[PDB]
């Protein structure tokens, strides 16, 4: 059996150049009146999965 990808993570991560992963940010769904503006605008931008989580994850996103 050819191995199934994981759709829940395929809907959330993108494989950039040089093999890293592009991820969104948490804490951006429905609580915004309470957080300061600075953390909100930093939170709008995207980030990249760290090394240990990548070491765990790499297998589960093998097929882009």
């Amino acid at each position: 059996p050819k191995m199934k990808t994981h759709r829940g993570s395929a809907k959330r991560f993108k494989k950039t150049g040089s093999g890293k992963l592009k991820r969104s940010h948490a804490y951006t769904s429905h609580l915004f009146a309470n957080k300061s503006q600075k953390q909100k605008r930093k939170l709008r931008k995207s980030s990249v999965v760290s090394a240990g989580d990548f070491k765990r994850i790499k297998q589960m996103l093998a097929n882009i």
Binding site: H6, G8, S9, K11, R12, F13, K14, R23, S24, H25, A26, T28, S29, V49, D53, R56, I57
Partner: protein, 49 residues
Amino acid sequence: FEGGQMPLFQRLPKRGFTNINRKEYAVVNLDKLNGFAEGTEVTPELLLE
């Protein structure tokens, strides 16, 4: 699975869509054009051959 700790993909939100209409164009840069001779006609079919 990380011991019942609510995993990373769950902690992370979802991103945008994809469309059925997606025209990925066949890339070629100018350096590949130097292989063909001077004064020649190039067409996608000749690119294929």
